[model samples]
Target: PLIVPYNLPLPGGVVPRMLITILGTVKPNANRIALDFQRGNDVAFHFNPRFNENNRRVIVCNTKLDNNWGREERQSVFPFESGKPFKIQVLVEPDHFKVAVNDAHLLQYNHRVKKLNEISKLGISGDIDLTSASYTMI
Candidate 1:
């Protein structure tokens, strides 16, 4: 499981594939972070101040590719929020990454790495405190 405690800022068109799980007490009034994939086809996951009062949890699958973005897609499992840290496990499959958050929620995204060599490098930017992060080939 990967523990990230930082806020990742994504450029308008940057796509990042990450398995995130959030934990901790999230502020009631916090702006939600978005998975900036395509300019118009990206997914935005945020914490609802009202909903967060009851549950502070979220999971997200991010990708920034034109082919990957579409109408026939599934929403992320958890509602993302700030100040919450959770555990996430990223399993890279043949065609996509299966992300499990807190071992309770799951989300999937099409792999954006077109080349095999690019698979070894993962990009991250945010104010998150990462406890652990790793990648494995299966």
Candidate 2:
């Protein structure tokens, strides 16, 4: 069992052609979970899954600049099951981040912060057992 609000530092930061992976299990009674890539106080990418938003399941992706959250890019898809294991992969591309859930393509988010190397911190929190997380060059 791993802890919540887990934070990991990227040794060389990030660049094009890198891969980030996270494996976890959703809590049986989970409602929300979040994964974020940050640079200092700014959040470069924020990924969240909500199970109880207006009785609709959804995933929200956004960015934070100067402590302000940007417009959410919402996807009305519930890819993870409560009390079950899931694998998430994020491929770093030149212009965006390609996310895959359970080995299936989920969504792509464009670069909002521009500087890849500055976004060196990865944070995960909420109702899930974070089993593993890693990033490597491709």
Candidate 3:
């Protein structure tokens, strides 16, 4: 699979209630895909919706500090299907993050890299075919 990665500089960085949407189609044998909110080399949030990677219905939420992976938070009422298109929404809050797949609440991850704006960039990478993506401060 071709690696289609995109990075957007958050002009003023992330604020609470900021909603970002990713639209993509999962490959039949999809392994995993990542949406990373980064502050230079540090990843404040790593949102991964994984299929064929977990026996239980799941996703992985975490952060990377100084290039080290933090313990992953995995659990989900998965709303994704192989070969189907999906819209995933990530919302920001003061205490943690809230994610929704196809408008269904999926999971939340607490802040590891504190202060929202430091996470100045949003990055996307992995196995599926992305259709469209956009971010808005709402």
Candidate 4:
């Protein structure tokens, strides 16, 4: 059974050049999905795909610190489809995260919180399959 919310720890934590892969399928009735990179009470990155916002899909990326969220970066370019599978990659770079979907380049977000190694958890929630999420530190 697929879980609503799933969490996994990065083996060696997030570092420059680390690659994180997330594979999942969008639910047929999916309205939203979210992925997060976190350290304790802070969210380093929040990647959300919304299907019911403004009657169109949007990708909202942001960061949160001390329970406060930063400015959201919303893009109207959506690559996810309902009832379809998708693969997401987040390449951790020295300054930002390079994101891609289905092997297609999506977008990148500059780091709002430094100390990359402290980002040790990956969280998945919302309308997505329990495919899998993993990290490669090399």
lDDT of 1 at 131: 53
* TM-score against native, each model: 0.45, 0.97, 0.89, 0.95
| Ranking according to TM-score, highest score first | 2, 4, 3, 1
Rank the candidate models, highest lDDT first. 2, 4, 3, 1
TM-score of 2: 0.97
For 1-138, candidate 4 gives per-residue lDDT tens digits of: 447598888765688888988898999989999999998889999999999897989999999999999999998889999999999999998999999999999999998889887888989999988688878765
Better of 1 and 2 by TM-score: 2
Off by over 4 Å in 4: none
Candidate 4 local distance difference test against the native: 0.90
lDDT of 1 by residue, 1-138 (tens): 234333333232222443333333333455333322222332322211122323643333444454453233445345444567655555545566565656754566664544422333333323444555443324
- What is the C-alpha local distance difference test score of candidate 2? 0.91
Model 2 lDDT per residue over 12-105, tens place? 6779988999999999989998989998899999999998899888999999999999999999877988899999999999999999999999
Clashes of 2: 0
As for model 1, its CA RMSD to the true structure in angstroms is 8.0
Superior by TM-score: candidate 2 or candidate 4:
2
> Which lDDT value does model 3 have at 111?
85
After superposition, candidate 2 runs with Cα above 4 Å error: none
Clashing pairs in 4: none
Question: What's the residue-level lDDT of 137 in candidate 2?
Answer: 83
